[PDB]
């Protein structure tokens with residue numbers, strides 16, 4: 001059974017089982033091309049593949065570019081093999097992913113960091129081309145070697161940027177995992193406190209906040225509740241602009257600017273597909 | 275277009291379309 005993966009210069013311990021063919025699954029280690037995501041049995045077979053493989057980045061269209069950070073839009077119908085390999089790779093670190101074969105109804109947004117050898121996988125999120133429940137993310141993953149550096153929140157922010165340009169309100173697919181929920185709550189906290197910091201008016205509706213942020217009204221209310229900013233005072237519902245929360249937020253978003261871990265809306269070059 | 279869950283042991287029901295008043299510390 002697969003315990004480790006060789007991925008570029010990294011050796012990654014796998015967390016959950018992924019349904020690779022038994023010919024590959026019975027081996028202890030899998031070697032993968034870091035650009036095309038094809039999986040191989042040995043270091044020797046990988047070396048020979050890397051000499052021949054023409055891919056230095058994901059397929060599809062580069063829709064975001066800020067220096068070394070890119071996002072590629074990959075259509076599951078146009079690049080089926082790449083997207084299946086990506087889903088099999090994702091399933092090694094995602095427990096609850098249940099889709100690896102029929103990738104045709106999905107778009108995959110693949111974030112990369114460039115160096116002099118090519119554009120290296122940071123993480124991704126998948127998205128239904130047409131979601132009945134208006135889900136703007138299906139699954140989301142930061143690769144283990146990049147985790148806890150701010151890239152997950154960049155991916156989340158990017159998913160809402162797409163929703164903003166589409167003139168839609170979005171939400172992640174249910175159910176949300178433990179780590180997913182922690183990440184989304186941090187993001188929703190940031191966006192809400194940003195809005196209220198910049199808003200000068202005397203009142204605001206949840207719908208107005210939802211329209212500007214592309215965040216679902218239920219998620220806004222949930223976040224308002226989590227921050228204890230919804231109060232009651234003689235008959236009416238009231239948004240409490242908490243002192244301590246906005247102070248710490250400015251200190252936090254100073255650090256966010258310093259480390260460059262932000263998605264810049266002006267660096268998106270995108271019109272919705274089809 | 276409503277939502278519910280308790281605030282300080284009191285179950286409440288909030289509209290998403292109505293303007294909600296924004297407050298600082300106060301009383």
Ligand SMILES: C/C=C/C(=O)SCCNC(=O)CCNC(=O)[C@@H](O)C(C)(C)COP(=O)(O)OP(=O)(O)OC[C@H]1O[C@@H](n2cnc3c(N)ncnc32)[C@H](O)[C@@H]1OP(=O)(O)O
Pocket residue numbers: 093094096097137138139140141142143146147148149150151152153154172173174175176177178179180182183186
């Ligand atoms: C709709 C869903 C379909 C799916 O099932 S998707 C499931 C969501 N994806 C997953 O669960 C896959 C596994 N992981 C990912 O891809 C996850 O990393 C992830 C994609 C979330 C998050 O990836 P990142 O680690 O790159 O996220 P950030 O570095 O941006 O951190 C975000 C936020 O979560 C915090 N965080 C991140 N990891 C941890 C931990 N470990 N413990 C405590 N706190 C954590 C973190 O500190 C942050 O909060 P603040 O400090 O308050 O700003």
Ligand SMILES: [Zn+2]
Pocket residue numbers: 033034035036037038049053054055
């Ligand atoms: Zn390759």
